């Protein structure tokens, strides 16, 4: 029509369709300029200033790229301009539901603040998309470019959140099933969302990315699998897919789960919880919401961003003193002190309901040394991190379909033994990090003794620095010697 | 405390001395995390999310690099750990005085809001440095690492702003003159500050940087010039310096003075001006300041960042409706409309006192064409932009000293004719951009007719699109052919 | 056969059509793996190992990109798959005629070895393309993919060399004129060939490129200019084009005309000249050719690459001793010694026929100092380098057509004065570099005295290091001081 | 006479000491400009034009970096300028022994040509270093810069090849043990050689590198481990080291063992074997050597490079017809055809003595498919590729020492279970690739049936494409269904 050109550092010159421009140029979309992609990460990696907004353009752009590519290779798929635009729109909009500091909000804050509700960024994205549509008169614009809003909005939301609830989708039929594998791939997780963040986060973080999305796209084809058309990878490229999940895991270990970044996320959460009663956000009809209740009114949620942090930091209301103090502690780098890191053994798993009980456990361990300070449950933070290949215990590569040079229309499967013996044996594990809220040297030492003792007690793995931090405790455990 | 290692995307792994960590970990320094480097630029270049904070670490790092390098090549300079630390500190701190949206604040807002006061980021940086020092008990830490606060604080501020009041400096004597040429080079402008921003802005903007600071540093030496020790470049490398200023010009043309970015800056300024009476920021002793008066109290200025934008945007105060509306217009992409761009001719220059009178001039032109809509002065914005090589009319390369392979201690001068005939004739020009506040089709057409007529009237250059936008007006002027 | 995917460092994953694969997979094309892009450059820039082969794939790929892009925006152009393939083929093949060490061969060797012949890489490329086609049965394969060999081969050669010989081309008609502006743009020089080399050479050289080809392509349109369809740039993008030529100039100053690289090129040439009688290359019908006569037989030229250097280096024939010695001198880094660099003044220019007379002139200058050695003409090399914007004295931007946002189908012109006063006044100049073949310290000093005297004599510019290398000579000339 | 600066694309501006320049500027060193780093890799990865020469400068530069860094952190190590220079020299020179096409020579050609002798690049490097030293009068230059040639040359060779002769080294004593861990790390393989090639190969190959050597160096310290001084990593960084080996394995899978690159290596080897009797290279005293015997005379080996390929390709000697033909087949892309790829199962391993018997085994399998063509042993190539983490069956991280934030001088050990459950179970495996030398469609089909049958017979893993290429063979094996 008249394409708008945007210069992205990761993707270069992107073209945006007028319809996408209209969706972008709304308060609900522009809100994402005020939400850091990596949350507390930026307080550790000074390069990670980037916000969800730019990620969103990238995801939208990549969605478009993959759908166009599948189109050009296989006209028999009958992919229409209508289909392309919906995949683009879903890509653009699948981050609409992120809250202040991204993962912090949906990962730490809302679980603690509103444990009765179950909340996901996906649900938020659907709701906010709905709000964006209705507040900005998008439906006629969609119609103007040949979209059918009733069906297409369904399709778009399904891309975002999954089956709305044996074919479960209502936005498109089975012959178009592959379209659901682009923006948010519930089948195996190979989706353009990941591709943008691997590239963009790395560009910002200052750590370089091993994975080539352009290659993946060139080698992508659609084939029949059990009477559904699905996206297939080239057989010989399976190694690259294993690599992709490895890359995801690396970025977690190096950046997204960084020990200090996590604590900063935790401290911001603590502050928000303490501020929750006193901060007001005005939603629909002038009705007032809290940080924790903004998820209930999309008009209010529109105005909930990283700005909440500075609203607290700059406040003078005495009621907000407690929250303000925690943020000040963050500024002076008076952070909770990292004690150590350990893992469960065998397939012992620690469920979410047990998280609360863990600080108590550490405080209750009885190391056989004299300690100048005695510490209590409240003095300890235990952070449990699930590291997996995106499908709990399962190997996502078992959920990928492949094709061979010699027969491109014929989908096959490849098992782990068929690829390499050097690949992981398991695909999920847990990290336990322990910090101490008491910052002084005497407290830190004591915390370490409790911690290493607790590790021994529960038959967790030997802390890497165990012999150094707790020389008196490590000889007790036979396995460690 | 010992050395902190920080991963920067531009520079890789930087080391920060404990003393620099102490300066960084303060409200006054951390404040820079909340100020966008390129201001409104981010609303045009979605990559340009970066803030002054990260730039500052880079500038500090680069300052350290150059001073260390000079040290290792020339021990005769007697550069001490004390010297290095001060150059690092100056580098770290020469952005402390930046206001919300960087250049917008000191370039547009303060000139309009407080025309009586004369305000520079440099002055702000000195003041905020002072405030940082005094609020955080830095002086004993400086002493602990062998600095002499009285002299060294002087040295640091002099690096930031220039002579504080025949050798004019009091922080260091003549034999150390070259130290003043690293962080903020008043002699010719080749300084590490530029080097960081060229690299970092490019990384973010998605433009590619063609200038090599590491090469410059390798080839840098200190030589005696008229009984002062100054930083000299290798003769052969002069072409690279011409290139460096060209690069600066390119970044201005392409990014920093982008027509839409400038308008967004302008609209944000307008909003702030309209908000100025109602937004209140608490400074020292609970005393209240306005956006325009925060520069008077450093405690208040500490809390003045990009956050002001969102404070306005999210306000419900009826008094703030006007300002809030402008920001909403920015969000809906209802911007002032670009009319055109022109320049003066010959030696005609446009003085600062005449800026106000220019909208009136455009509205007063008599196009000799029938118009359905008539426009007024207030419907036009005229932005005058000075593009120069950093030294007004002068060629900064004439203020650089060089040395030869054959005699490394002997400074020479190189003239323009000695380098290339293909270099610029002049080193300063002006751009005049005109926008119209009336957005509709009929108004835009009219604005163009006035504008092109005005250009003709004043013997400005023919707008590039003159024949297209104003076909009736362009034939009048003979010079335009 | 379907698409072959090839992973290029600059361009990422390229697709090659089966027809292109067939052209590539021939001795005539694979020959380009054995010819360094930057010739002697690699002996200065250790990164510059790249060969013409890879450049060729890139130029082919970019040709395809531009033609496809024009196609997608403007179906009214009626661009066919046939057209695309021919543009691709031309792009792929316009380096086929390069000789050993690239520019060394066509720039230094053939002019000296065969002054009667006029030889260009373009002519060579046409000839070699013809040989490739005929030796490998390409014409039927072309037909198989819907090319019409008679017309299409003509089109391809015309793209490479210009009109083979008021519309001069026979491969396509006027309505398709813009196709001639892609691979080798005789009109203004903005062509994909440059785009690949800017990107690739920089990647290898370790110097970074300022210019964005992908942006150019996004903003490219075809418009009617004087009843021909031509490629037009967007008005506002003119600044970028001036930048492009500046970039070209920079790469010449920094890399392609580097003083040592040029001498190495010169020494290699000298060696080849001395080896010319004794090296034999077998051509068509078992007939034998020399380095200098291989351009006469394409079968022999096929076997003429950088390999001749090592054939000489490794030779034991006493007849080859002289040539072998020069190459050995290159290996021991016993190079001709750089004396200095100067330029003409005003409009005086130095014609190609006068190059020979210049060594004599330097040797004949009478500096008023006592010298222990006296030097002769043959001891001096004078290298004259033309640096220009690709169209001799002319400004190539005067040969570019533009379009405006408001009227995309309407081509306009933009003059220099309409863009910036900071742009170059002239577009062509000459560098004179002088080296001395006598390497010892006494000879070097003497050579400098002759040289600086000669500069004075001819009213050339003062060498940058004049006061250092020749302190006795420089005071004589009033203008210098 | 003084320091050379050289611009490397990977490392930027390197400084080279005069002594290093003298070593570089010799026929023995310059020879490495004519040996492709990745051998046949360039015929698959068009970017991989780079030669051993440039790699060598990088390895030398990085060696210098690590030794300097250890120096600056720990002056108590007593590292001298002498030590630095020797580590630089070893780094610079540990590729001197590479033959034409690098790994082709030492991996395929010499094993086949001279099975009686055991030959390594390391041994070649030592010999060539000796030859370089003696032919170029380096010993006096070494003395001039404060080296003691007898001791230092010993040290240098020991760095390259291991103990020349309870402390086994004679070049330095135990207190300097860590110096042996920089250039060629026999303990665990973490050496600067790898660091350069990861960076450089990636830069050229067009794959991005996910390992950060600069980070490693910043975190490196020397500690006492069992009364030897060793290079230790920070505890927290162990995950990065696991990543490093994973990256090495990826580069092997993706680039260094690429199926086509390996075949091209194999074809070049075949050609050389066929050329071996007729190519003559003149060594010391005019005595004549063959490709296979050049390793016996360093004077001859000096003149043995990639140039042998082109000597063959351009030859007219009828005796060389057979070798010439194979190279011509490479040019026409008439390569031996990839049949398939398989692995052993469980801990079954395939002995080196059995490699020769494997083609026979494939030819002897009796597939139940109807075939027009019967193939013989000589029609099949069976390539067994050992992929491991550089220490056979062993995990190199078990051979790394670590230190903790809290006690930097105290080395500890970290086991696999202490790091992650998602790490590899084994650290060595085998790939079996089969090609067929008969190129035609009918032969290829037959070869596949033999191959998949052979796989079944020997209880190898099911080829990835087994059910597609050999549908008639695959149902026989129960395990595969
Ligand atoms: N010269 C440049 N080089 C690189 N990127 C640029 C340049 N100019 C602008 N950009 C970036 C900024 C934006 O992300 C994107 C849009 O480009 P630009 O043509 O400036 O848009 P615009 O909307 O101001 O132009 P138009 O006048 O056609 O509306 O490209
Ligand atoms: N694995 C990694 N690779 C690259 N950059 C990293 C990695 N881990 C952290 N970084 C970045 C983030 C920070 O800017 C910087 C320092 O990281 P890190 O050494 O983990 O700090 P830290 O303060 O947590 O460690 P310590 O235990 O030494 O106090 O480097
Ligand atoms: N995993 C990889 N990642 C990046 N580039 C790769 C990878 N594998 C190969 N390449 C490069 C090498 C070549 O330039 C290009 C061709 O890819 P590749 O798939 O290896 O071709 P191929 O011809 O060997 O396979 P096939 O003929 O079986 O499809 O991509
Ligand atoms: N302007 C440049 N920018 C980047 N790299 C450059 C530039 N000029 C040269 N190089 C590269 C080429 C070589 O790798 C290295 C050495 O450059 P250069 O300074 O020209 O040495 P040189 O030996 O010719 O100078 P001199 O002999 O006068 O010291 O840097
Ligand atoms: Mg998802
Ligand atoms: Mg400045
Ligand atoms: Mg050209
Ligand atoms: Mg090794």
Numbering used by the authors:
A (entry chain B), B (entry chain C), C (entry chain A), D (entry chain D): 113 to 277, 284 to 599
Show me the paper's own sentences about this structure.
Sterile alpha motif and histidine-aspartate domain-containing protein 1 (SAMHD1) is a deoxynucleoside triphosphate (dNTP) triphosphohydrolase that cleaves physiological dNTPs into deoxyribonucleotides and inorganic triphosphate. SAMHD1 also inactivates the triphosphorylated forms of some anti-cancer nucleoside analogues. SAMHD1 mediates resistance to anti-cancer nucleoside analogues, including cytarabine, decitabine, and nelarabine that are commonly used for the treatment of leukaemia, through cleavage of their triphosphorylated forms. Tetramer formation depends on nucleoside triphosphate binding to the allosteric SAMHD1 sites 1 (A1) and A2.
